[PDB]
From a paper:
After crystal screening and optimization, crystal structures of RhCESH[L] and KlCESH[L] were successfully resolved at 1.94 Å and 2.02 Å, respectively. RhCESH[L] and NoCESH[L] share identical sequences, whereas KlCESH[L] displays only 36% sequence identity with RhCESH[L]. The core domains of both RhCESH[L] and KlCESH[L] can be well superimposed (with an r.s.m.d value of 0.944 Å), while there are some notable differences in the cap domain. Furthermore, residues from the core domain surrounding the catalytic pocket in KlCESH[L] can be superimposed well with those in RhCESH[L], while some significant conformational differences are observed in the residues from the cap domain. Furthermore, similar hydrophilic and hydrophobic interactions at the dimer interface are also observed in KlCESH[L]. Careful analysis of the obtained CESH[L] structures revealed a potential active catalytic triad consisting of D18, H190, and E212, along with the active water molecule in RhCESH[L] while the corresponding possible catalytic triad in KlCESH[L] consists of D48, H221, and E243.
Numbering used by the authors:
A (entry chain B), B (entry chain A): 41 to 276
The structure:
């Protein structure tokens, strides 16, 4: 009997691409600048992923994801003419967008229906501070906020998923992992979780290949959190 | 400026005395025993607190709060003549009441007013699973659910208060600890937190004397979460 649902956040529930682009161009429209924010996002994510690789590879000490995004921003703005005009405080403002990630239109209605039938919680690699603020700013209801920062690691570390089971007080087969990333669902299913895949074809913006094809080990396959709620029988 | 409020749960927000005594009485009606549940309650908590102190002093391995309550229950049932007539399943049902504690009348309206103005989170010694279920069952809104289980300790360990600051991403002077127990606010105020004391004159039942006098280090003294919300300017 399913009892709790754990949701990945970035990409699965929120649209970080549209957030960085539209809030960046407004950030540059206030000071007077001109930059391709689509290429800014890829570089920021690349530096963010170039540096978190080092953390678990041992080439960088552990630090919250907000700090990694802030430091990655310093590395990418060195390759931009307007980057020097942004002081230490201007770059903190830019970095705070990761705590303001805009939700997909189906996220709030689907989460509310699921919470009325199950225990719901986050389980993502982001910082607790950012995920907390993303859910509060977006009025996304959860019964708890859990990130891998609570065990100083990141998915697919088995102890991140054990954190979910220990915190909610249930066994693996009573829990479901919801995500748009297949490495997440593979690791959770290995540990006995149920897994629900949410196809997010626009996660990385236009002209990007996204693997959304169904897999046999998926317990559920949906194109929205609202659709997943209907499959689980979580009505209005 | 205040940014986040952290709440103790047991006693501060929920009435465990009334939950145990009444639900224990209802539990006993269909099983054929009558007991004085005001003494069973304080025997349970005394047994729990003694086994908990063994975990703290290193004389017993760490387990969740629910497991200590469950073993304390086995302890007190051995001292009552009707204890043997309760099998393991009956005792798990009795022990589950620690996850169903009813809130005080003021808790739900006060938390919602405070959440519309601040980030709010729990920060108690209970288990994550029980505090999570207490808020879900009682419709107590929090932006986050934190307990000392997340650092495998107990207040007033400074690690528990640092967990609150790390998870929400603020500094001590921007956080307030809200509790009905003075030991909690003493440690938090020592660590830079603001502190709000909520007087719960009936935390331990009708005729047990309770320390509710004001203290000079309190930033706020209230008799309800509703009153604290008014003192902080958080109107409906
Ligand atoms: Ca919440």
């Amino acid at each position: 009997g399913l009892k709790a649902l754990f949701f990945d956040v970035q990409g699965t529930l929120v649209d970080f691409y549209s957030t960085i682009t539209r809030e960046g161009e407004a950030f540059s429209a206030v000071r007077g600048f001109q930059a391709d924010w689509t290429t800014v996002t890829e570089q920021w994510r690349a530096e963010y992923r170039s540096r978190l690789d080092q953390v678990i590879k041992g080439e960088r000490p552990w630090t919250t994801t907000d700090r990694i995004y802030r430091e990655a921003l310093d590395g990418i703005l060195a390759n931009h003419p307007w980057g020097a005009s942004l002081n230490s405080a201007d770059r903190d403002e830019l970095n705070s967008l990761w705590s303001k990630l805009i939700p997909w239109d189906d996220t709030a209605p689907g989460l509310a229906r699921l919470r009325s039938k199950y225990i719901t919680s986050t389980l993502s690699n982001g910082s607790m501070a950012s995920v907390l603020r993303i859910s509060k700013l977006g009025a996304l209801p959860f019964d708890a906020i859990l990130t891998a920062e609570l065990v100083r690691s990141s998915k697919p570390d088995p102890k991140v998923y054990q954190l979910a089971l220990d915190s909610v007080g249930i066994e693996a087969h009573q829990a479901m992992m919801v995500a748009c990333h297949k490495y997440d669902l593979q690791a959770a299913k290995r540990l006995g979780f149920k897994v629900a895949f949410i196809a997010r074809p626009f996660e990385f913006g236009p002209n990007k290949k996204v693997d959304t094809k169904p897999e046999q080990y998926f317990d559920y396959y949906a194109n929205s959190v609202v659709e997943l709620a209907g499959m689980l029988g979580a009505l209005e």
